[PDB]
Design a protein around this ligand. Structure first.
Ligand SMILES: CC(C)(COP(=O)(O)OP(=O)(O)OC[C@H]1O[C@@H](n2cnc3c(N)ncnc32)[C@H](O)[C@@H]1OP(=O)(O)O)[C@@H](O)C(=O)NCCC(=O)NCCS
Ligand SMILES: [Zn+2]
Length: 197
């Protein structure tokens, strides 16, 4: 693909009439999915020079829940498979990284009671853990800009508000190769915690 759309990330050949119409339609579906405009209430939990993180809590309004689900449909398409869903959808906390009225990062966190050290295989010895990182995604063109690091930072101070969770209290659900490279660095160990492995 000779052309990269800076706004939806699609890679395609602008010279091709098939491609330009298909990009037009992909571009529309994508920007609708990540657009972040007109929430009556935003629970802003962290502010940065290049964006902010908004927290969506259980029993928040329909429009917030729907926005999370729209983003998750795009992540499902990008991954190409159904990642293990949260056990109880009404206990999850969702963190959205917003930049220029767009969702460019999403972290879904769920309560867990145990996790397992990874060696890929993992140990059969359960370790007590508090917070399961059930989903983590950053828009492709915004990667390697610390968005995922800041989302996990924010989970560590918001998931159990009033305490700062250690990297021994968070675990990563069923990590992808990208997730494994991220978690190894974030946790400063190749033997971080996982669940749904
Ligand atoms: C995994 C993911 C969320 C990381 O998001 P990100 O915002 O780019 O990550 P960060 O910028 O916070 O990365 C922090 C460190 O993690 C490491 N890291 C992150 N992503 C990496 C990658 N694709 N390859 C190697 N190292 C990587 C780097 O050490 C990075 O530090 P550096 O940029 O200073 O070198 C992102 O790659 C993604 O969304 N991938 C597609 C969806 C996916 O697979 N999610 C994981 C499911 S477990
Ligand atoms: Zn586009």
């Amino acid at each position: 693909g000779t052309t990269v759309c800076k706004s939806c990330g699609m890679i395609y050949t602008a010279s091709n009439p098939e491609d330009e119409i298909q990009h037009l339609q992909h571009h529309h579906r994508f920007l609708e999915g990540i657009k972040f405009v007109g929430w009556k209430r935003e629970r802003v939990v962290a502010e940065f020079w290049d964006g902010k993180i908004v927290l969506v809590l259980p029993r928040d309004p329909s429009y917030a829940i729907k926005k999370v689900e729209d983003v998750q449909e795009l992540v499902d398409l990008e991954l190409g498979f159904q990642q293990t869903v949260p056990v109880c959808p009404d206990k999850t906390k969702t963190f959205l990284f917003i930049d220029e009225k767009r969702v460019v990062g999403c972290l879904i966190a769920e309560p867990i009671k145990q996790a397992f050290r990874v060696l890929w295989r993992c140990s059969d010895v359960p370790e007590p853990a508090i917070c399961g990182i059930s989903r983590i995604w950053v828009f492709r063109l915004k990667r390697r800009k610390r968005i995922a690091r800041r989302l996990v930072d924010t989970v560590r101070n918001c998931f159990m508000f009033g305490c700062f969770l250690s990297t021994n209290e968070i675990a990563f659900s069923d990590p992808t190769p990208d997730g494994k490279l991220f978690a190894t660095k974030y946790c400063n160990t190749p033997n971080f915690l996982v669940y749904n492995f």
